[PDB]
Design an enzyme around this catalytic site. Structure first.
Site, PDB file in Angstrom:
ATOM      1  N   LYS A 165      32.891  72.455 -12.924  1.00 39.31           N
ATOM      2  CA  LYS A 165      33.596  73.258 -13.942  1.00 39.31           C
ATOM      3  C   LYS A 165      33.291  72.795 -15.372  1.00 39.31           C
ATOM      4  CG  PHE A 200      27.376  56.045 -12.720  1.00 39.21           C
ATOM      5  CD1 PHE A 200      26.611  55.235 -11.895  1.00 39.21           C
ATOM      6  CD2 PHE A 200      28.360  55.451 -13.508  1.00 39.21           C
ATOM      7  CE1 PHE A 200      26.877  53.868 -11.804  1.00 39.21           C
ATOM      8  CE2 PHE A 200      28.639  54.119 -13.411  1.00 39.21           C
ATOM      9  CZ  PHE A 200      27.908  53.319 -12.567  1.00 39.21           C
ATOM     10  CG  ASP A 238      34.468  58.191  -5.008  1.00 39.45           C
ATOM     11  OD1 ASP A 238      35.334  57.284  -5.011  1.00 39.45           O
ATOM     12  OD2 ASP A 238      34.634  59.321  -4.508  1.00 39.45           O
ATOM     13  CG  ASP A 275      35.838  57.292  -1.384  1.00 36.37           C
ATOM     14  OD1 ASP A 275      35.942  56.066  -1.291  1.00 36.37           O
ATOM     15  OD2 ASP A 275      36.276  57.940  -2.357  1.00 36.37           O
ATOM     16  NE  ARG A 286      31.921  64.477  -5.333  1.00 37.47           N
ATOM     17  CZ  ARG A 286      33.161  64.010  -5.527  1.00 37.47           C
ATOM     18  NH1 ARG A 286      34.023  64.723  -6.226  1.00 37.47           N
ATOM     19  NH2 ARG A 286      33.537  62.853  -5.048  1.00 37.47           N
ATOM     20  CG  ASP A 345      40.202  53.953  -4.330  1.00 41.83           C
ATOM     21  OD1 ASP A 345      39.365  53.859  -3.407  1.00 41.83           O
ATOM     22  OD2 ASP A 345      40.921  54.955  -4.514  1.00 41.83           O
ATOM     23  CE  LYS A 370      41.825  56.937  -7.506  1.00 46.85           C
ATOM     24  NZ  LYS A 370      41.440  57.388  -6.109  1.00 46.85           N
ATOM     25  CG  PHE A 409      43.020  65.763 -13.097  1.00 42.30           C
ATOM     26  CD1 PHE A 409      42.974  67.131 -13.338  1.00 42.30           C
ATOM     27  CD2 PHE A 409      41.942  65.165 -12.466  1.00 42.30           C
ATOM     28  CE1 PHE A 409      41.867  67.884 -12.976  1.00 42.30           C
ATOM     29  CE2 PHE A 409      40.840  65.920 -12.086  1.00 42.30           C
ATOM     30  CZ  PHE A 409      40.801  67.277 -12.352  1.00 42.30           C
ATOM     31  CG  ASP A 467      41.262  64.198  -6.539  1.00 47.22           C
ATOM     32  OD1 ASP A 467      40.458  65.142  -6.497  1.00 47.22           O
ATOM     33  OD2 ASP A 467      41.053  63.094  -5.990  1.00 47.22           O
ATOM     34  CG  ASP A 468      45.682  61.070  -4.741  1.00 50.10           C
ATOM     35  OD1 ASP A 468      44.454  61.001  -4.954  1.00 50.10           O
ATOM     36  OD2 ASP A 468      46.424  60.108  -5.009  1.00 50.10           O
TER      37      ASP A 468
HETATM   38  O1  LIG Z   1      36.628  63.475  -6.060  1.00 45.42           O
HETATM   39  P1  LIG Z   1      37.261  62.471  -5.162  1.00 45.42           P
HETATM   40  O2  LIG Z   1      36.320  61.883  -4.131  1.00 45.42           O
HETATM   41  O3  LIG Z   1      38.511  63.111  -4.518  1.00 45.42           O
HETATM   42  C1  LIG Z   1      37.884  61.150  -6.277  1.00 45.42           C
HETATM   43  O4  LIG Z   1      38.818  61.710  -7.229  1.00 45.42           O
HETATM   44  C2  LIG Z   1      36.646  60.692  -7.080  1.00 45.42           C
HETATM   45  C3  LIG Z   1      36.859  59.598  -8.133  1.00 45.42           C
HETATM   46  C4  LIG Z   1      35.858  58.648  -8.218  1.00 45.42           C
HETATM   47  C5  LIG Z   1      35.957  57.624  -9.157  1.00 45.42           C
HETATM   48  C6  LIG Z   1      37.054  57.566  -9.972  1.00 45.42           C
HETATM   49  N1  LIG Z   1      38.040  58.464  -9.866  1.00 45.42           N
HETATM   50  C7  LIG Z   1      37.968  59.479  -8.986  1.00 45.42           C
HETATM   51  P2  LIG Z   1      38.757  59.848  -5.356  1.00 45.42           P
HETATM   52  O5  LIG Z   1      39.349  58.784  -6.272  1.00 45.42           O
HETATM   53  O6  LIG Z   1      37.686  59.203  -4.487  1.00 45.42           O
HETATM   54  O7  LIG Z   1      39.831  60.587  -4.570  1.00 45.42           O
HETATM   55 MG   LIG Z   2      36.171  60.045  -3.257  1.00 44.59          MG
HETATM   56 MG   LIG Z   3      40.328  62.498  -4.068  1.00 46.39          MG
HETATM   57 MG   LIG Z   4      37.208  57.144  -4.126  1.00 49.26          MG
END
Ligand SMILES: O=P(O)(O)C(O)(Cc1cccnc1)P(=O)(O)O
Ligand SMILES: [Mg+2]
Ligand SMILES: [Mg+2]
Ligand SMILES: [Mg+2]
Ligand SMILES: O=P(O)(O)C(O)(Cc1cccnc1)P(=O)(O)O
Ligand SMILES: [Mg+2]
Ligand SMILES: [Mg+2]
Ligand SMILES: [Mg+2]
Lengths: 340, 340
Positions: free
Chosen positions: A48, A89, A94, A98, A103, A165, A191, A230, A234-235
């Site tokens: 986006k 990056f 990540d 993870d 993506r 994390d 993070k 935010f 995301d969570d």
């Molecule tokens: O986009 P994702 O993987 O849901 C995530 O927000 C990606 C991300 C990477 C680095 C820092 N903050 C968020 P996450 O924290 O792993 O849930």
């Molecule tokens: Mg992730």
């Molecule tokens: Mg996430």
């Molecule tokens: Mg992560």
């Protein structure tokens, strides 16, 4: 939206970004430059672009129109793309860490046949491109060192948060006692909050000559709270979002993450529900993940999220009333409209 | 050696490096700071410290003794450790991507139970520490931006070289036609020569106020050639070195690498020997790796390496005679003694 207005010019600048970054193709490195172009095209395009666009939008709102010359706008678009590159990056690494699958609607870069762990170096290259662009476009500007330092600090903060994390989410080792509200806030502050919201507005501020510690502290008060919300969203979306919309498959439960959802679960769960969570969390089995989702639905966590979003929105607006001055409130209001 | 003289003070400064980098333990990030300390202790300690020491040795040789105050020496030791940290960052990622087993006599960080791919972020943290140290110790010095830019450029060069290394060595895909002398030189120039030899001397030069483009170009002429030889030696030792001495198990043959050895093999091999190489290279089977080593021994590649080292040494010494001035030749001669 002011974002919809600024996007076309912004997205069109990407072709120039790629051209300039592949233009020192030193013919001997041409195979590497072709690879960099592939990494850039696959990973920096398809989102986006809200973080990058925020630099552009805030720049227009903070720099006097008489000072928004052609070359100044070019620099603002470039710095917006540097923000997108930093995100790129971080996301490529990540996704490896993870164990993610998709993506932005496509297979994660590292999952692509023939890429695999070579993605580690590809991610380092994305990071390197930031400082290449800053030198190429901003080296003679008085804010050059401020921007270099801002991006480096932002990277360090994000890496510290990523460490937290991953430490709080050890694989195959479920201890729900780790998952506290205090731990959650700390993880997400580092993070996500710094690079997602503070970084792009701060960049625009420096570019406008707004370098004061007080002004940056006040902007932080708003923007770090936006960043927290935010990440909470995301969570929530990791489990309850539509992957056709989010573009990515959730892994938080399988990955034993300190998600906002698990923290809220633990706040409400009876001893019996606690045992169910304990027996089913942090494991790859689809049936176990499903029992966790069912527990969350039983505890009305979607309803809890909806309430939290309403309360968070009102809080950030109160923070804008307190802390926006002397900046135009529209700088923050536009971003708020975009995320809520 | 001048290196043996400078080492104790240098190695003793590490405890201070770690203390300063863990001293902003913001109690909420303490678990992350404990992890950073573990990563630093495991990965930045246990080597010979020659790249870092080169900063210290060259500094003493280039800055007038009257200007080598206590604080100046502290900065020189810090910048030497920044060089070691850059190497650490690159090696932790490289070990993942090369599927290596050991490094500096111990299991690779990523192979350690409980670490795994979390090493990716640990490596990013090592990289971040460089810019933290540069800000903490050198921010008020006139060479601050030169050093920031030198380390960033060095990282970008190394990452481009790593891209070439990995592109030329695709897993399970053996095409010996890729493995040319011209390709080899290009890979090693970027992946190793810049950060290994040019970076530390250039850092000391900037710290001494020697910032001229001509002076840096002349130093490069010597130092990039030293870096090439050193990578050729690394390649030789990958197969023929004693891992009790080298501290690491070789993977080049299994990993389908464009090693100096395979390039020299291809230069001498008959059509029959070519087929043997083709059938046995780039594969995990111990018996196949052994047939490649046997072919190399049959073609007298150890003898070829010995001759090349003699000829390279004489070449770099000729380059020192040509290009050292106005710098003290001892700057280069000491480093030469250390690597040959
Ligand atoms: O986009 P994702 O993987 O849901 C995530 O927000 C990606 C991300 C990477 C680095 C820092 N903050 C968020 P996450 O924290 O792993 O849930
Ligand atoms: Mg992730
Ligand atoms: Mg996430
Ligand atoms: Mg992560
Ligand atoms: O120490 P290693 O793994 O033998 C090596 O020199 C490490 C290295 C990593 C990055 C850049 N240059 C050398 P490589 O190239 O992988 O043979
Ligand atoms: Mg290696
Ligand atoms: Mg390698
Ligand atoms: Mg090697």
């Amino acid at each position: 939206d002011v974002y919809a207005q600024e996007k076309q010019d912004f997205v069109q600048h990407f072709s120039q970004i790629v051209r300039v970054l592949t233009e020192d193709e030193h013919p001997e490195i041409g195979d590497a430059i072709a690879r960099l172009k592939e990494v850039l095209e696959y990973n920096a395009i398809g989102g986006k672009y809200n973080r990058g666009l925020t630099v552009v939008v805030a720049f227009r709102e903070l720099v006097e129109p008489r000072k928004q010359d052609a070359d100044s706008l070019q620099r603002a678009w470039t710095v917006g793309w540097c923000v997108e590159l930093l995100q790129a990056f971080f996301l490529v690494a990540d996704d490896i860490m993870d164990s993610s699958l998709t993506r932005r609607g496509q297979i994660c870069w590292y999952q692509k046949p023939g890429v695999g762990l070579d993605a580690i170096n590809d991610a380092n290259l994305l990071e390197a491109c930031i400082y290449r662009l800053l030198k190429l476009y901003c080296r003679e500007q008085p804010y050059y060192l401020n921007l270099i330092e801002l991006f480096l600090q932002s990277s360090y903060q994000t890496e510290i948060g990523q460490t937290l994390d991953l430490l709080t989410a050890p694989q195959g080792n479920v201890d729900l006692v780790r998952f506290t509200e205090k731990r959650y806030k700390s993880i997400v502050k580092y993070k996500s909050a710094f690079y997602s919201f503070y970084l792009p507005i701060a960049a625009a501020m420096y570019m406008a000559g707004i370098d004061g510690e007080k002004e940056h502290a006040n902007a932080k008060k708003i923007l770090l709270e936006m960043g927290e919300f935010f990440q909470i969203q995301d969570d929530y979306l990791d489990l309850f979002g539509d992957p056709s919309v989010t573009g990515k498959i959730g892994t938080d439960i399988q990955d034993n993450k300190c998600s906002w959802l698990v923290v809220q679960c633990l706040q409400r769960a009876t001893p019996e529900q606690y045992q169910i969570l304990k027996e089913n969390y942090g494991q790859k089995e689809a049936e176990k993940v499903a029992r966790v989702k069912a527990l969350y639905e039983e505890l009305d966590l979607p309803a809890v999220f909806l309430q939290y979003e309403e309360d968070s929105y009102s809080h950030i607006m109160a923070l804008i009333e307190q802390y926006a001055a002397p900046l135009p409130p529209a700088v923050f209001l536009g971003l708020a409209r975009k995320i809520y």
